[PDB]
């Protein structure tokens, strides 16, 4: 909520949402969801911030490894 | 539960089995003591002080019999001593069980050699810290055998195990011969004894068994204070 | 119980103690075997002996039945216990259906246990890699490899052992149908393969051979130099 | 000394229809001289498609029933699927084996549907052996019950007798007469009948009063 | 590090990443979110599939006239504790004649997978079993965890992006003891539809839902009876 | 490194970490309180709210072991049930081979040697659990264990586990268990929890207390709704 | 922040790595490389460079100035499986 | 420097089954085709040596007269497998006297597929393709190293699989016949196999709700060749 202050934040926050789903986070690592996503919404070109966007960055932020992994439930 | 079900031990690159080897250090800081046969039955003497004036003497013991005719002294470590004692004490039952007659001193040092063999090769132990001392006076003629961690065996006229044993060996050398006596052995075991022994000897110092053709029994502090008496 | 997995799989999906046991096959002597239309002939070379001592023990050629013959390498000791369970087996198939064994049942029979072998605990595979020749009921001879995963696989001609593809390449270069008319004509392929390899002045080759209907014979080192005399005859006037 | 075994009475009874099929039985459960109650049916619906009578030792009945309806529910959660009649005789036949050096004490009589809306009888021996049968009396007073079937059902030993096949109402009073003609000259035949009949729809129950001697 | 190979061994700070691991397993499966009303308990599922001319993976299974679950993680395990469940329903079905008790089965749960979270060289259970059931007090729902740390609930959601869902059933949490079915289940599809992107939802072949009734066996509903349920509901919102 | 690996290492100053680990683990449940009265004990536990989600009465960190016996556990919770289903069975072994009901110095004896078992090997781990035990007996008074997770038990007027454990047993020597009959002890032993677990760690809390005596006939038993009312009346005079 | 993984390239990304090393040496016209990127499931870009660059060598080998397809698969043979002894991937794999 | 047998991964699935999953792209291609009309399938034997005799070796095995299988990867560990499936097959029609349908065939197996551990070795190395007809009509299943089973209706698997997938998607449709399948896989088979295509490449097997389970031979096998 404090790194997220100087963006264009559109009403599409759910910080509680937000934090309940990212636990074991410092805060470099929150800042660093604040800012992914800041990138994020600059690659598809938008001017305002939403909810996916820190959706996307809480992955990178994670920075998971890909290995096909599609065959499960 | 269960164990680990693999040998501890494998052998080196310059192909040594450096469990083994570091037994054998572990035998060598043990106290020394020293074992002579002369011609009607074998004499062990061992070194054993205690630490401090606290103790008892008499509680516990070196000179351990077998059986009617058998004594056995070891120069190592304590705990690991008493339970292969205990293992040989119950094989000379089996002996006796099958056989109804007291058994010979060689088959006995067979049995226990497979033991500790049979265990430095078991999985997931380490091997024994011991070497022993093993006497017996069967169809008349004594014999003196030594054990090792390794599991094999010897058959010494008279040696020296636990400290300074090359010396006393050197010692043993330019004492002893064929011809001598039980007495005899006992004055100069007492003598290489005190070659390695410390300032005072004194009756509970030490402490010496005997076998004979009446078979093996232990010293009192008596006979064995009359015996550091007279001496040196 | 001792329950270690052994054979795990590596982080680009390779069976390391099964390569390395390749390997162990890979330095074995090299053993050549071919087949004919009416009497197969298969051969082991690089006897190395002392020239001075009885060998009948080292013999690296046995039987499972009559009509079956199997060769062998990589280590000694691994292969003969493998052979007595063959043995067991393909005599426990007698003991149930009356015909003499199939060699393809029987390469089935080792292959399959190879493989469970690899499967189970605590167990290195094992470092053999076999050549088994055997002509079946109504005469069709024919024969198998065994690699030490476990894969049973027919051929005309093989050869394995330290050296052999090489010995491939000339038993490709130098196999046809009318090398394969005359059964001395075989056996000089054969002395032509294994003299095409190393060395082996007939004191290092021990070939033997079967009829299809007859058990094996082991020919004396007087027929190693006769075909081989021949051969170098042969190549002498071919020169 | 300690019998394992006592004899408890009842008599079932099975009529392959050509698209039905019909199982009867009586209610008494007894033994010795006395009598342990008035009340004890011999139908049990595995299926809508599917009844069972068992009789002998109850105990065992009982016990193989509850094994039974376990075992649909095995094969219906490992095939996603019902069971058929003759899945249900492969597999009770193997039942019945499974205990051959301490068997049952149990007469077993299967009725059902086939896989063609035609009736199907699969009689069984305490061992385990069957086969398809169209009648099938089982119980006490089976003696009794089987050759009036055999002269009315089978058309046995009469001459020029056409072959008419089974009405259901004539078999609802073949059995209503038949189970009165047994029950006047056996002592374990009950005081109720409970009849149950499968059809293409449904399993249709009816109960008829008996003597009680 | 080396803090992080074995069940056994614990953490300096005294948390087994052995079972962290294992939470990643549930997550990585596809969503799905049961729930209860006052006399009915609903679950619902997100198929998914590999190619267009794979079928779909079913996650829902029957286990019991009373009794169904949901599955996310592993299909080996979730059979293997599958042939468990039905087997300790019928058990206790053929011992005592009755139905058995939902909590006091979840507890057999919890007590068996815990013994392989505690030995040397055993895994923990990958599978985030939603659990539907009857006891005689009607309608529950239980989720399980790798932990086996069992949750009783009323509303929960697990797999790939729950939290949305979570959030969902919290704002509208306070509805679900009052409506039936016909509108129940279509809330549960407006939590399912939450948890999708923006371009794709409900193509009658990748959900499917399971109903237990207060006088209804549990019945798994699929493609073609999803369609009465899966229409009237209101189109995505942009 | 390299010390801190098994169960069956030692430290080379001569101690276990893994067992040290698990103790930490126990830090981070949340609080288990429990004094005797008079003529009894109570157990007390407040109990985090997650999400609005869950149902009341769900996971209760509060178990009953035999009919007199009770059990508040601090840890893992399948760890913990799993210690109340062999202790609960290790009763049943004491009245199915004696005749009558296990008293606690036994049953602590055998449950603290059964943790211990634990403490040895390389093949498993130990507990991350630590619960307390506490009962009445008309010919023995009543009785408060607690055993931690290497299996050390001892005897209590009073104990306390989870997260402010100082915090909450510095205020429980203020009372004099001694002489109250607990029908006050509900109220205090309600408040003193009440004082903890602020508003900035926890978002909101619930409680649940345990009730055993000769008040409560031998038998135990949760409290009633009215008495847990009467301390949640009792809640709100620690602003003052 | 920035935690880019570089990993094994899956096939098309194997296949342009053969058509970067490999636009620029006489080759013949009618092969391909799709074959080869089948043939290397696991292989970095050094090791397909020295395919490239080893076939070439294969094509110096008689007297040849455009190299074959079977010469890419003598280079396979070798580059891969006569050298798979070392290879030096795959404890590197789990970066240990 | 060597973890356990039965480690999850920081991403959190295995190492040694996801291992298992990448030991199988070295196996030979194979393709099977689900239609209506009946079930093809086909495969490439991956022929060394002219000195080899290429009948020796298959792919195609069947189970009973309505289930064939097809494999890929290791081959020598799959005869396991096909045993296990042939003995239950069995062990359903000596208990019920019926057919054990396809898909509870493969689930079958799949219990079978993750077993291993310390008690009492490791994954397998195969992927397994199961043509069946049931009552349900044609069938066909698609196994995992991991268990996990899937119906498919044109399956490709092996070394070139990814490339057959999409090369096979765009040519199947619902309403396909058996000809126009087994020409059409072929079609795919000639361009992803290494060597010319002949009667000795390949084998095929089909299976038809009227018939029993069939494999083709060197004599009915050419006429689609040259019909390519």
Known sequence: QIHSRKMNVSPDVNYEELARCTDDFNGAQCKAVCVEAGMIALRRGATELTHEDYMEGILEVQAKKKANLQYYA | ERGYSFSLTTFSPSGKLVQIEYALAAVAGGAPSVGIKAANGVVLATEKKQKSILYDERSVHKVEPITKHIGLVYSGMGPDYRVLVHRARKLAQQYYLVYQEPIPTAQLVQRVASVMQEYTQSGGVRPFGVSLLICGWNEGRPYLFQSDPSGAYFAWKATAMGKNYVNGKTFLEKRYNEDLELEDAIHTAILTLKESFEGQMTEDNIEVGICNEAGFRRLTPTEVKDYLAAIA | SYDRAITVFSPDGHLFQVEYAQEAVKKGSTAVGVRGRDIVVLGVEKKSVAKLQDERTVRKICALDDNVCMAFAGLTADARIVINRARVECQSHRLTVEDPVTVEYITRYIASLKQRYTQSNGRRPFGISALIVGFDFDGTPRLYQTDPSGTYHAWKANAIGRGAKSVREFLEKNYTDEAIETDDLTIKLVIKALLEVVQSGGKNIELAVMRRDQSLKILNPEEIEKYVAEIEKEKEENE | ?213 | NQYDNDVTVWSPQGRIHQIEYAMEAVKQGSATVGLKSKTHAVLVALKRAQSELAAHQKKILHVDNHIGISIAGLTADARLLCNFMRQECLDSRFVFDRPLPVSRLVSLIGSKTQIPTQRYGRRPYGVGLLIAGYDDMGPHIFQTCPSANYFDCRAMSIGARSQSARTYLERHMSEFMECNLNELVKHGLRALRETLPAEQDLTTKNVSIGIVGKDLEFTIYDDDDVSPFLEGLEERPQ | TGYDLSASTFSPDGRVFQVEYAMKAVENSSTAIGIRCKDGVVFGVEKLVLSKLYEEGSNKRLFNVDRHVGMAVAGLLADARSLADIAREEASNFRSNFGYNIPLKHLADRVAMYVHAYTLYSAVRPFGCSFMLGSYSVNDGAQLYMIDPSGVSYGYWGCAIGKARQAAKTEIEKLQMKEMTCRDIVKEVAKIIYIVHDEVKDKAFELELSWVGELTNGRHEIVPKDIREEAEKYAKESLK | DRKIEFSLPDLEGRTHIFKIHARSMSVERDIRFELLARLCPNSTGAEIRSVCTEAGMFAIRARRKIATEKDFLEAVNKVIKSYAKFSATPRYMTYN | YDRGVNTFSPEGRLFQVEYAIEAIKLGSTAIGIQTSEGVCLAVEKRITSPLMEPSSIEKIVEIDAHIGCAMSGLIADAKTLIDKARVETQNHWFTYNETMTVESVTQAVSNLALQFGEEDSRPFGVALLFGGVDEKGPQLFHMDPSGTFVQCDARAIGSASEGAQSSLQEVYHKSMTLKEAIKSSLIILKQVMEEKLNATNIELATVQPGQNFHMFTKEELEEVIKDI
């Open chain 4, 1 to 213: 000394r300690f019998s394992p075994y006592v004899f408890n009475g009842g008599t079932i009874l099975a009529i392959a229809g050509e698209d039905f099929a019909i199982v009867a039985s009586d209610t008494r459960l007894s033994e010795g001289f006395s009598i342990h109650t008035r009340d004890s049916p011999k139908c049990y619906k595995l299926t809508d498609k599917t009844v069972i009578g068992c009789s002998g030792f109850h105990g065992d009945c009982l016990t193989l029933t509850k094994i039974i309806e376990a075992r649909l529910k095995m094969y219906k959660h490992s095939n996603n699927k019902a069971m058929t009649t003759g899945a249900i005789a492969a597999m009770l036949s193997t039942i019945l084996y499974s205990r051959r050096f301490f068997p049952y004490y149990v007469y077993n009589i299967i009725g059902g549907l086939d896989e063609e809306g035609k009736g199907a009888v699969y009689s069984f021996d305490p061992v385990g052996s069957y086969q398809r049968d169209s009648f099938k009396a089982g119980g006490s007073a089976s003696a009794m019950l089987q050759p009036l079937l055999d002269n009315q059902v089978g058309f046995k030993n009469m001459q020029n007798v056409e072959h008419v096949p089974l009405s259901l109402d004539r078999a609802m009073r073949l059995v209503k007469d038949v189970f009165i003609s047994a029950a006047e000259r056996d002592v374990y035949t009950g005081d109720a009948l409970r009849i149950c009949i499968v059809t293409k729809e449904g399993i249709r129950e009816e109960t008829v009063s008996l003597r009680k001697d």
